[PDB]
Design an enzyme around this catalytic site. Sequence first.
Site, PDB file in Angstrom:
ATOM      1  N   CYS A 108     -31.386  27.132 -27.187  1.00 22.55           N
ATOM      2  CA  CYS A 108     -32.107  25.977 -26.346  1.00 22.55           C
ATOM      3  C   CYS A 108     -31.096  25.880 -24.868  1.00 22.55           C
ATOM      4  O   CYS A 108     -29.901  25.978 -24.740  1.00 22.55           O
ATOM      5  CB  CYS A 108     -31.522  24.815 -26.890  1.00 22.55           C
ATOM      6  N   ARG A 155     -29.335  22.094 -23.509  1.00 23.14           N
ATOM      7  CA  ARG A 155     -28.300  21.673 -24.275  1.00 23.14           C
ATOM      8  C   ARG A 155     -27.382  20.962 -23.272  1.00 23.14           C
ATOM      9  O   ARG A 155     -26.295  20.543 -23.735  1.00 23.14           O
ATOM     10  CB  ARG A 155     -27.271  22.822 -25.014  1.00 23.14           C
ATOM     11  N   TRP A 200     -37.921  17.312 -23.502  1.00 20.51           N
ATOM     12  CA  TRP A 200     -39.091  17.482 -22.538  1.00 20.51           C
ATOM     13  C   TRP A 200     -39.412  19.116 -22.105  1.00 20.51           C
ATOM     14  O   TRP A 200     -38.300  19.753 -22.482  1.00 20.51           O
ATOM     15  CB  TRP A 200     -38.736  16.744 -21.309  1.00 20.51           C
ATOM     16  N   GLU A 202     -42.824  27.065 -20.594  1.00 27.37           N
ATOM     17  CA  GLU A 202     -43.219  27.039 -21.957  1.00 27.37           C
ATOM     18  C   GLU A 202     -44.702  27.207 -21.834  1.00 27.37           C
ATOM     19  O   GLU A 202     -45.436  27.591 -22.926  1.00 27.37           O
ATOM     20  CB  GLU A 202     -42.520  25.887 -22.713  1.00 27.37           C
TER      21      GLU A 202
HETATM   22  C1  HEM Z   1     -34.291  17.395 -23.213  1.00 27.01           C
HETATM   23  C2  HEM Z   1     -34.861  18.711 -22.928  1.00 27.01           C
HETATM   24  C3  HEM Z   1     -34.944  19.959 -23.563  1.00 27.01           C
HETATM   25  C4  HEM Z   1     -35.450  21.028 -22.804  1.00 27.01           C
HETATM   26  C5  HEM Z   1     -35.983  21.208 -21.417  1.00 27.01           C
HETATM   27  C6  HEM Z   1     -35.287  22.248 -23.859  1.00 27.01           C
HETATM   28  C7  HEM Z   1     -35.800  23.441 -23.594  1.00 27.01           C
HETATM   29  C8  HEM Z   1     -36.110  24.435 -24.711  1.00 27.01           C
HETATM   30  C9  HEM Z   1     -36.831  25.734 -24.604  1.00 27.01           C
HETATM   31  C10 HEM Z   1     -37.239  26.315 -23.316  1.00 27.01           C
HETATM   32  C11 HEM Z   1     -36.761  26.247 -25.655  1.00 27.01           C
HETATM   33  C12 HEM Z   1     -37.576  27.639 -26.027  1.00 27.01           C
HETATM   34  C13 HEM Z   1     -38.759  27.304 -26.971  1.00 27.01           C
HETATM   35  C14 HEM Z   1     -39.688  28.633 -27.032  1.00 27.01           C
HETATM   36  O1  HEM Z   1     -39.567  29.393 -26.269  1.00 27.01           O
HETATM   37  O2  HEM Z   1     -40.367  28.674 -27.952  1.00 27.01           O
HETATM   38  C15 HEM Z   1     -36.090  25.429 -26.462  1.00 27.01           C
HETATM   39  C16 HEM Z   1     -35.630  25.774 -28.090  1.00 27.01           C
HETATM   40  C17 HEM Z   1     -34.768  24.895 -28.792  1.00 27.01           C
HETATM   41  N1  HEM Z   1     -34.636  23.747 -28.406  1.00 27.01           N
HETATM   42 FE1  HEM Z   1     -34.581  22.938 -26.763  1.00 27.01          FE
HETATM   43  N2  HEM Z   1     -34.896  21.739 -25.101  1.00 27.01           N
HETATM   44  C18 HEM Z   1     -34.663  20.279 -25.131  1.00 27.01           C
HETATM   45  C19 HEM Z   1     -34.169  19.518 -25.921  1.00 27.01           C
HETATM   46  C20 HEM Z   1     -34.117  19.779 -27.231  1.00 27.01           C
HETATM   47  C21 HEM Z   1     -33.491  18.932 -28.174  1.00 27.01           C
HETATM   48  C22 HEM Z   1     -33.560  17.285 -27.872  1.00 27.01           C
HETATM   49  C23 HEM Z   1     -33.389  19.515 -29.379  1.00 27.01           C
HETATM   50  C24 HEM Z   1     -32.724  19.218 -30.617  1.00 27.01           C
HETATM   51  C25 HEM Z   1     -32.354  17.746 -30.790  1.00 27.01           C
HETATM   52  C26 HEM Z   1     -33.550  21.120 -28.937  1.00 27.01           C
HETATM   53  C27 HEM Z   1     -33.446  22.029 -29.953  1.00 27.01           C
HETATM   54  C28 HEM Z   1     -33.723  23.408 -29.637  1.00 27.01           C
HETATM   55  C29 HEM Z   1     -33.757  24.345 -30.695  1.00 27.01           C
HETATM   56  C30 HEM Z   1     -33.369  24.250 -32.060  1.00 27.01           C
HETATM   57  C31 HEM Z   1     -34.440  25.293 -30.248  1.00 27.01           C
HETATM   58  C32 HEM Z   1     -34.811  26.593 -31.021  1.00 27.01           C
HETATM   59  C33 HEM Z   1     -36.220  26.586 -31.286  1.00 27.01           C
HETATM   60  C34 HEM Z   1     -36.695  27.842 -32.130  1.00 27.01           C
HETATM   61  O3  HEM Z   1     -35.955  28.431 -32.396  1.00 27.01           O
HETATM   62  O4  HEM Z   1     -37.806  27.780 -32.381  1.00 27.01           O
HETATM   63  N3  HEM Z   1     -33.986  21.275 -27.885  1.00 27.01           N
HETATM   64  N4  HEM Z   1     -35.576  24.400 -26.138  1.00 27.01           N
HETATM   65  C1  LIG Z   2     -38.008  20.580 -26.797  1.00 27.13           C
HETATM   66  C2  LIG Z   2     -38.570  21.772 -25.872  1.00 27.13           C
HETATM   67  N1  LIG Z   2     -38.477  21.807 -24.693  1.00 27.13           N
HETATM   68  N2  LIG Z   2     -39.102  22.701 -26.695  1.00 27.13           N
HETATM   69  C3  LIG Z   2     -38.934  23.309 -27.743  1.00 27.13           C
HETATM   70  C4  LIG Z   2     -40.082  23.792 -28.625  1.00 27.13           C
HETATM   71  C5  LIG Z   2     -41.187  22.980 -28.361  1.00 27.13           C
HETATM   72  C6  LIG Z   2     -42.373  23.646 -28.791  1.00 27.13           C
HETATM   73  C7  LIG Z   2     -42.512  24.779 -29.584  1.00 27.13           C
HETATM   74  C8  LIG Z   2     -41.564  25.335 -29.829  1.00 27.13           C
HETATM   75  C9  LIG Z   2     -41.015  26.770 -30.591  1.00 27.13           C
HETATM   76  N3  LIG Z   2     -40.149  26.846 -31.522  1.00 27.13           N
HETATM   77  C10 LIG Z   2     -39.953  25.013 -29.269  1.00 27.13           C
END
Ligand code: HEM
Ligand SMILES: CC(=N)NCc1cccc(CN)c1
Lengths: 419, 419
Positions: free
Chosen positions: B118, B121, B290, B295
């Site tokens: 993520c 974070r 968000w 993405e």
């Molecule tokens: C608030 C702004 C946030 C942004 C801009 C953001 C952005 C991202 C991005 C770009 C990814 C990659 C997704 C992909 O390529 O498929 C990601 C993955 C992830 N984010 Fe965030 N995130 C945010 C919030 C969160 C929140 C609130 C949580 C959890 C409480 C979170 C948990 C994770 C996890 C676990 C992944 C791994 C997803 C996976 O392995 O499939 N994110 N996030």
């Molecule tokens: C919260 C955020 N910006 N992105 C996390 C997310 C959104 C849609 C699909 C996936 C694929 N695991 C991850």
Amino acid sequence: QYVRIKNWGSGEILHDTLHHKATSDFTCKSKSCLGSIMNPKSLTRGPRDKPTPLEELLPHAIEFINQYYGSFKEAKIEEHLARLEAVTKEIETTGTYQLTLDELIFATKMAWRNAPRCIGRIQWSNLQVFDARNCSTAQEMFQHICRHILYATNNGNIRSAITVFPQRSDGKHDFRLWNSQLIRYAGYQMPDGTIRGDAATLEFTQLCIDLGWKPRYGRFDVLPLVLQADGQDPEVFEIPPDLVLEVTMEHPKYEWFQELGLKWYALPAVANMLLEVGGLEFPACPFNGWYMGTEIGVRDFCDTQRYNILEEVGRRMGLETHTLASLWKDRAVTEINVAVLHSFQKQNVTIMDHHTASESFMKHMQNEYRARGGCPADWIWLVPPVSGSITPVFHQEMLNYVLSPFYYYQIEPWKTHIW
Amino acid sequence: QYVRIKNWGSGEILHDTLHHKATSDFTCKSKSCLGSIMNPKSLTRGPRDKPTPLEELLPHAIEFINQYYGSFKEAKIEEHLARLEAVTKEIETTGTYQLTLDELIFATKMAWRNAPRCIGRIQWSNLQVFDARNCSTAQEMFQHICRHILYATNNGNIRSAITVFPQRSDGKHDFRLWNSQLIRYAGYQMPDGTIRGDAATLEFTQLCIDLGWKPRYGRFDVLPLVLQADGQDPEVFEIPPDLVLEVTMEHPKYEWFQELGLKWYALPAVANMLLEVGGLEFPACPFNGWYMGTEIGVRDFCDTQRYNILEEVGRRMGLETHTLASLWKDRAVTEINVAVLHSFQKQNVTIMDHHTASESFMKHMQNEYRARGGCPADWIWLVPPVSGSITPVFHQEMLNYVLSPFYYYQIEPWKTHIW
Ligand code: HEM
Ligand SMILES: CC(=N)NCc1cccc(CN)c1
Ligand code: HEM
Ligand SMILES: C[C@H](O)[C@H](O)[C@H]1CNc2nc(N)[nH]c(=O)c2N1
Ligand SMILES: C[C@H](O)[C@H](O)[C@H]1CNc2nc(N)[nH]c(=O)c2N1
Ligand SMILES: CC(=N)NCc1cccc(CN)c1
Ligand SMILES: [Zn+2]
């Protein structure tokens, strides 16, 4: 058994069995992952104080000889067993052994073939080998290198080649090139704290100056060759200017591009890596291939720590250089990449864009899996510095492991050198 | 001791000690490196048949309680020891334990904080937690999810939030969302072999159709929620259209962009991950944040395996769509990224470009190292799908390890489900 590997782009699956031959431990631990480390120890082969122990060498030597003779279509058991015997005797009687020219040729192409961070491995079989194993002095080194540069540059039509100097004996008489690359620009730290030229070569440039080289203080000053023969101190040699082919950068639309005064050498030659084969080590084996656009366009010109020309080209394009979300960096870097490719083609210097490189590597990877069930590949290095997901390698899962033959890194000679 | 880590962009060095708390083994072996694997087992937390053994749970539970009470500025030893006692008794008497709302809140933000993939974070502390641990039926689930979607969407001004449903007991009564994301488009394979909509949801779309959902056959058809409460079979619920906010794509120059008929949901909500904390497991805890431009712009629209709109936008730009080295893909994808950002801003929907995201993550990473000497980070996922080296994270070395609390993947419910 095999490890299942998938390509999320095609959905295709591969079974990697080749990794079973991997040697020592890699970077990433058992519970931690150190995959984004540029210089892990598992990738470096440092100096030695004494000869390699017979007990270690023999086992490896046999292994290599077996690998060599195994590579043939319809074998030569007799010649094979014969060779194993001769090598054994040679180690018993001399304390080491000499590779036949053919085996060296095979060894260099395999090590290339086993370079996990190389995207052009589809060319692994097309490589010219210059045998300089007889070299004795720095002067002779300089001569060989010059032959190499001249052969490789080939008036723009680049040719892949490698020059193999004497193998390490007791590690007390190592042949080494103190340069990172055969041809590279110097970095000068101007009095006012301003860096000029290639910041990446600040320390080395100083070393050359220290060794008496005369600093010209320019953005693009080709550095001298610093050769070290038979454990002797290093001697500095200027590289004949006629031998160094360069491409002046210019954009096919923005005629103001020439006004940036950019150029770059056409020959990407790695000078400080170590070749390992059959228990043998070659601390001096400069090799070369041809450039992939992004190396120059993206990394060399735009790396904040290199020439960092991204904001200038940005302003010269009249972009919202102060509104990061305008994606001006995305616009700029792309034009700089077009200038590099365009300028190389214009002047007839071999080069390949990243999209094309990526495609061929996938082709190679497929051949490697059909050929030997595996391909040591470092995803972090193989994916281009721009257009990541737009290239197919980004979507391909891969395993990174150190096989043999291999090209290792080495510790900087000026650190481990008794003057 | 600490592991030295460097940022080739600034030359800065960090010492990671936090990895010492990592649990089981990760992906990459001792000699092989499986870092580019999307779904390694070290990242998945599958189903269970019986309760977690007391011997295992208690040790973890104590660990978590200690971590919680340790997070306070100026502790509460009394409350602390008190809590440890109550939890012990609770496990002895019930066979498991219940987290105080506060600890759940702490647990969800920490797990986010410990999500190596993520990039956002830096927001780990700003997260709304909806306690649905009392939920009993699918209908109640659907109700909670709706509250979540409505709360998170916030009329465009997106708010990060997570809804925690009942924890797994014997693993025979698991609450699960069969959807990959709370809101997503369906993929239909037309008769003539042509895929329509989101190819990534072909199998799931079929599952919904199988469960009786009526297929509308459109490029952008929002899929139904398939809820599974207390180990019961799943029930399908249509999501109230008023609740699903969408952004219609349009470029600020190429007015022909609207003619592509593109749009995308504004809420990125992960629905199928499992939350682990103190030996407890939550197989149903949908969360959201968000979007980050790339993405949608890069992956969703340009992935050959998704909407694959890259050649169309290429032709519509009159680019040398058949000369790969023209770098037309580089030009296209960038404009598609500008359309996404522009179209989101135009309609007032929170979104962040990749350059800005990357910058903040570096800031966060620095805070994390000063705060606790480490930050589990997966380089392969954190580096944007475009402009890799142009962003600072590309030049930062990092260690990827699984801590606790954590958000694990799970096996697809339709595979491990007794109807
Ligand atoms: C608030 C702004 C946030 C942004 C801009 C953001 C952005 C991202 C991005 C770009 C990814 C990659 C997704 C992909 O390529 O498929 C990601 C993955 C992830 N984010 Fe965030 N995130 C945010 C919030 C969160 C929140 C609130 C949580 C959890 C409480 C979170 C948990 C994770 C996890 C676990 C992944 C791994 C997803 C996976 O392995 O499939 N994110 N996030
Ligand atoms: C919260 C955020 N910006 N992105 C996390 C997310 C959104 C849609 C699909 C996936 C694929 N695991 C991850
Ligand atoms: C002929 C075409 C070739 C192309 C286009 C090519 C391209 C590349 C690229 C893009 C890199 C990354 C460099 C960086 O980012 O710093 C690389 C690395 C590497 N290549 Fe190749 N290569 C070619 C030939 C060769 C040859 C002939 C050899 C050896 C015989 C070779 C050995 C390697 C090795 C070992 C690395 C790793 C360098 C390092 O770790 O610092 N390459 N190559
Ligand atoms: C920190 C990280 O490992 C480092 O920046 C890597 C990433 N990928 C790379 N890939 C290539 N080809 N060359 C490099 O120098 C790097 N640098
Ligand atoms: C094969 C490889 O691991 C895979 O394509 C990864 C690479 N990096 C990624 N990074 C993010 N953020 N999301 C992804 O889905 C991926 N896919
Ligand atoms: C042969 C080729 N295209 N590139 C390999 C290369 C050239 C210059 C520097 C480096 C940095 N190790 C690698
Ligand atoms: Zn690894």
